[PDB]
RNA sequence: CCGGCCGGGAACUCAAAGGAGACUGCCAGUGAUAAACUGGAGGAAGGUGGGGAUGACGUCAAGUCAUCAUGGCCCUUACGA
């Protein structure tokens, strides 16, 4: 929801699923790029977190 | 006396052919879930892989009567030989 003035009074539910997906799309990107193991796997670390 | 000179062999180089194959088959991004384009792996060859042949109705009364033939015109003691 918008805040009077020009800001946002949002419940972090969004700011976590956004994270679940920012990281998620970046992960699929990192695989089309075919980056080395431990790096894209460190990405799956961030996916499970 | 290694310009394979003499045996020997049938897989290959080469060649005459029956066929496989490459068709956007797969992943991803972009994008109106369509099509399409780019990159990469796969792959002998990749985005109709390259080239020739194939030239849609027509434009130009453009070429050939000098391959030849032809409705006709001229010559037939001739230009015919």
From Swiss-Prot:
Stated family: Belongs to the RNA polymerase beta' chain family.
Function: DNA-dependent RNA polymerase catalyzes the transcription of DNA into RNA using the four ribonucleoside triphosphates as substrates.
Name of the protein: DNA-directed RNA polymerase subunit beta'
Species of origin: Escherichia coli O157:H7
Domain of life: Bacteria
Assembly mode: The RNAP catalytic core consists of 2 alpha, 1 beta, 1 beta' and 1 omega subunit. When a sigma factor is associated with the core the holoenzyme is formed, which can initiate transcription.
Lineage: Bacteria, Pseudomonadati, Pseudomonadota, Gammaproteobacteria, Enterobacterales
């Amino acid at each position: 929801v918008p805040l009077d003035g020009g800001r946002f009074a949002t419940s972090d539910l969004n700011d976590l699923y956004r994270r679940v997906i920012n990281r998620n799309n970046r992960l699929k990107r990192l695989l089309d790029l075919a980056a080395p193991d431990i790096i894209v796997r460190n990405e799956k670390r961030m996916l499970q977190e």
